[PDB]
Amino acid sequence: XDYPGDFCYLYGTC
Amino acid sequence: AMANNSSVANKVCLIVIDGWGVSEDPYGNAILNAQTPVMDKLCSGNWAQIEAHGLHVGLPEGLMGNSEVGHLNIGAGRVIYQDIVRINLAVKNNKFVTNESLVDACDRAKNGNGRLHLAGLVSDGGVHSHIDHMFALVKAIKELGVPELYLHFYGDGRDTSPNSGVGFLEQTLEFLEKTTGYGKLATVVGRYYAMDRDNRWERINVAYEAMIGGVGETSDEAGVVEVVRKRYAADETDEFLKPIILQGEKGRVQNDDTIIFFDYRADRMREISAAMGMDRYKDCNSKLAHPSNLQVYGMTQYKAEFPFKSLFPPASNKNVLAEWLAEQKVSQFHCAETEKYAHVTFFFNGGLEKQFEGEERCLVPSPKVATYDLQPEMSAAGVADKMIEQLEAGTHPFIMCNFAPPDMVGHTGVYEAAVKACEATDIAIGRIYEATQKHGYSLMVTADHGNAEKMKAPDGGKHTAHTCYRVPLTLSHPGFKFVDPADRHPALCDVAPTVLAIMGLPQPAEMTGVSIVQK
Ligand SMILES: [Cl-]
Ligand SMILES: [Cl-]
Ligand code: NA
Ligand code: NA
Ligand SMILES: [Zn+2]
Ligand SMILES: [Zn+2]
């Protein structure tokens, strides 16, 4: 969530 | 409002349906089997089908889309390449050797004491790092002429098997000796110690004292695999390897040294990288003296408050739609219910918390039910009410919303609920459509990724996930035909260029997607 394309964007919230 | 509002050639209402993909297969297809007379008509004649997953939206190939990624790509008018995809492209196209920050780190070593370190998780786990990235780093550093290079190998055993370490160790040894003939292994220690993220600084200190002081078991290239095997026989696996020390003092992080962490996942790098370069070595509570004048580089940004240069720093995302409209002095409206409110703000606006001049926001409360299958319509009627209010007012030349139910009710797996959510969504879309025709707006309907079109697995089991299907792009304006890009499928990056064209506004150079309509 810290920057666009970081690891949290791989799968997101759901 | 804002000064140039009326200069627009067409006002545009953009609906982003959440989890509404295009499947011709009717089995478990909540959209097809729901009553959807509105989308049946909007998704006919001149409409498009655009990609919302995989490499089309900057994610690895075969990876389903998601709300954060999809709203980001829609709002940005460009593919935002996810770290894994980005670095893998750099590796395949030999772009490390021209990477600005890497050249900067090698220049620092070359102009200083000649010493450079690599540190990070050594395996093919792909969650925090990839061994292939480290090898490409060594090759590029060699070609940039750095005098002296050391590697600090963090054992995995968590994203890979607990006894795979010895194989990555063997590879690394052989690669340094025979493939590059350049670079030396200095440290082996488990991620348990090196890659803590729970402020357990007694764990960090083990890794820190190994890197800085050589506190651990002495070995060399001939012996270190055997050392590891003995730890395995003792039941100490990769994650938990206690330090092994190679090259003696030469291989420690010393005064004036430069260091590159090569993990691209930030959370488990923040503690050890701050111990080395952000004045947090004190929390390690070590008796060793801390080296002076260290410079740290990370593969990506680990914390914006860190002074470290990054080899792959964040996409700046200048002039996403929301910013560009304010720059053109055009006002705008963003509406969602609670569950997707961040998606029409933080993510739609470029993956950061910034609200632009003339941008109005509206939140509709989601219903307070245990699970959303218990109220499949969620708050779609309310989102539509607020959008119709804006269309009757005519103030904002661009208005957009999210409809939550197909995604959020799909995640429950309850097929009949998903049908009701798709019917509630279609009803709301039809009410917005009628308001747009009555007040002079063009309607475009899309989605951020699929979900509710596949509610059953082949074995008839519940399917509670997003999909790799295409999503719709519709357009009520009759003066336009949908056209494909020259070189690729259309995708979410093309939504915002198309809106701007339809609106008669300029496309910023940073939007590298393309309008997929012709006039
Ligand atoms: Cl992990
Ligand atoms: Cl983890
Ligand atoms: Na239907
Ligand atoms: Na699904
Ligand atoms: Zn979802
Ligand atoms: Zn979504």
Residue numbers in the entry:
A (entry chain C): 1 to 14
B (entry chain A): 20 to 538
Original authors' sentences:
In all vertebrates, cofactor-dependent phosphoglycerate mutase (dPGM) is a 2, 3-bisphophoglycerate cofactor–utilizing homodimer consisting of 23-kDa subunits, while the parasitic enzyme is a 56-kDa monomer cofactor-independent enzyme consisting of a phosphatase domain connected by a flexible hinge to the phosphotransferase domain. In dPGM, an active site phosphohistidine (H10) equilibrates the phosphate between the 2 and 3 positions of glyceric acid, while in cofactor-independent phosphoglycerate mutase (iPGM), a transition metal ion–activated serine (S86) mediates the phosphate transfer. We previously discovered ipglycermide, a potent inhibitor of iPGM, from a large combinatorial cyclic peptide library. Our results show that the high-affinity binding of ipglycermide to iPGMs freezes these structurally dynamic enzymes into an inactive, stable complex.
